[PDB]
Design a protein around this ligand. Structure first.
Ligand SMILES: Nc1ncnc2c1ncn2[C@@H]1O[C@H](COP(=O)(O)OP(=O)(O)NP(=O)(O)O)[C@@H](O)[C@H]1O
Ligand SMILES: Nc1ncnc2c1ncn2[C@@H]1O[C@H](COP(=O)(O)OP(=O)(O)NP(=O)(O)O)[C@@H](O)[C@H]1O
Ligand SMILES: C[C@@H](O)[C@H](N)C(=O)O
Ligand SMILES: C[C@@H](O)[C@H](N)C(=O)O
Lengths: 296, 296
């Protein structure tokens, strides 16, 4: 019959966790409904005219087809998507559709797949714009909390639930950054010193989560000198914003490949940091860590 | 009057934790005694003729002088050292003397310094052969357990006690590897792909310790493709040994800059893995995680 879900936006990289770390947000999210239909075609409806309805281009259609073929399902599906945020925002918008679809198909056709397999299937949607199955946004979208994609072929995801309170502020510029281009501009090689720094700071962030230390987590998050300083130059007022909220947040950095900005405000300054972000970007959201795709 | 301590050998790097991770061993260790003397000179006695007695070259003398001057102590010290293992073995031999001395001076002159400051002082001994204050061996020697040096200037050390049982096997070749040379041969730059791999695998090792997962810890430890494959070529039979103990250990890798080899055998094959290591290197030791410098 049919299944409807809310599939969350996610923030990847988190500074020194480039291509590994993922943090699931509670908002924004896509609302996706999948209905089994007798005709074997896959029909897609989406409320954002800039997103393809062709089932071989829309990531939801790509993921559904792969799963339907893999299990010889024999039915088509009509997928209706209401977008939480536009693509190219650095918030895992496409991944929300890829993950939500994987989860919905799994429920609809009772495939009983585990979370890792759902992330693996969702990652095929993320391939439609990569040449490679990136899973750092679809992993948190499925698992909720904080995730680390620690291996590919085969995929490995380690999950750390966030049991404490972690306020999040997200500023969403109206401009977009194409992720392939965002990657082309990155250095092809990094110095041994940056390797040592990022490995240490990233490991420190993991220790910080197990020790519920927001200050440590946020400070190490801001120590990347390899990727963030390069991509931050694509974002108007990003460095000025970092300076203005300096002692009022545990940390602030680029969400995914940008241009969205993610900040972890200190309890005492949450309204003030939100207002500062709003001053620059009217589309600013207050949220927290999410629990992953779920039925709605 | 006088203070006598046992200062443990330590294993740094642990594969993807290059220049960050440190694991304290219970054995071998140096036995170091420090006695306050009226004359302000620093006298050093050491049972290894290949180690300098000049107080400005022996790391124990360098560390003691720095601490004595910093606190206007006004007394000299006579330091007697009985070495656990030779320098250039990849087991933090010099660091054991540096850390043991820092700890002993702190006790002898009642300086009440915390562990981090002791590691910082010990790291000045490690400077006598670096140009830089490396702390990845002195940190575990002082803290015990597993440590991560996550920042320099100022020094930051995160400590993770090892509460579970972790059997360790150490093979000590009779040859030495000069650490400065071991570093010169490393690549000056690494690919973005290796940065992603090592950050993810190193973070996975941290997660593995908090989840007491030896298999995960050991497997990720062996995923470094940047440093270990280069230095392993300096160690006779190292790759052959890895292949022979393959399914009998949680993991095996180079200790520090080598040539010593550190393995974490599975409970079922401990005698068999020790015998294999002994076949190649008569000086093989069975040990476990240590608790750091202590009085003896
Ligand atoms: N259901 C969908 N939702 C969003 N984008 C889609 C969808 N289906 C196909 N796409 C296309 O795929 C591309 C995904 O772009 P991308 O810039 O990576 O968005 P992103 O999914 O928002 N992730 P990121 O910016 O990395 O957080 C765009 O070209 C989209 O047109
Ligand atoms: N008390 C000491 N114990 C050991 N070496 C010392 C000591 N004092 C001075 N040294 C000298 O410092 C150098 C330290 O060499 P090194 O090869 O790094 O040993 P290592 O301390 O054994 N550490 P590593 O091999 O990195 O685990 C040698 O040249 C030694 O002669
Ligand atoms: C987030 C995704 O676009 C990738 N980690 C880059 O950056
Ligand atoms: C262990 C020390 O020699 C340094 N981490 C190298 O390798």
């Amino acid at each position: 019959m049919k299944v409807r879900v809310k599939a969350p936006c996610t923030s990847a990289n988190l500074g020194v966790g480039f291509d590994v770390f993922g943090l699931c947000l509670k908002e924004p999210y896509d609302v996706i409904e999948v209905e089994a239909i007798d005709d074997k075609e896959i029909i897609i409806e989406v409320d954002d005219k800039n997103i393809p309805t062709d089932p071989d281009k829309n990531v939801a259609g790509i993921v559904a087809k792969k799963m339907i073929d893999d299990f010889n399902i024999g039915k088509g599906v009509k997928i209706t998507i209401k977008k939480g945020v536009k693509a190219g925002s650095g918030l895992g918008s496409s991944a929300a559709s890829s993950a939500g679809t994987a989860y919905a198909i799994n429920e609809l056709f009772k495939l009983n797949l585990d979370k890792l397999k759902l992330v693996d299937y969702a990652s095929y949607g993320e391939l439609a714009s990569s040449g490679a199955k990136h899973a750092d946004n679809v992993a948190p979208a499925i698992f909720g909390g904080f995730t680390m994609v620690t291996n590919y072929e085969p995929l490995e995801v380690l999950h750390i639930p966030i049991d404490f309170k972690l306020d999040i502020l997200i500023a969403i510029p109206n401009i977009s950054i194409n992720t392939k281009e965002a990657r082309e501009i990155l250095p092809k090689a990094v110095g041994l010193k940056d390797l040592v720094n990022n490995v240490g700071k990233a490991c420190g962030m993991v220790y910080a989560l197990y020790n519920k230390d927001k200050s440590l987590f946020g400070r190490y998050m801001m120590s990347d000198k390899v990727i963030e300083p390069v991509r931050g130059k694509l974002i108007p007022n990003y460095f000025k914003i970092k300076e203005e909220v300096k002692d009022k947040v545990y940390g602030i950095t680029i969400s995914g490949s940008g241009p969205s900005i993610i900040a972890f405000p200190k309890e005492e300054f949450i309204d003030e940091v939100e207002n500062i972000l709003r001053d620059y970007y009217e589309n600013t959201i207050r949220t927290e860590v999410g629990k992953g795709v779920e039925v709605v």
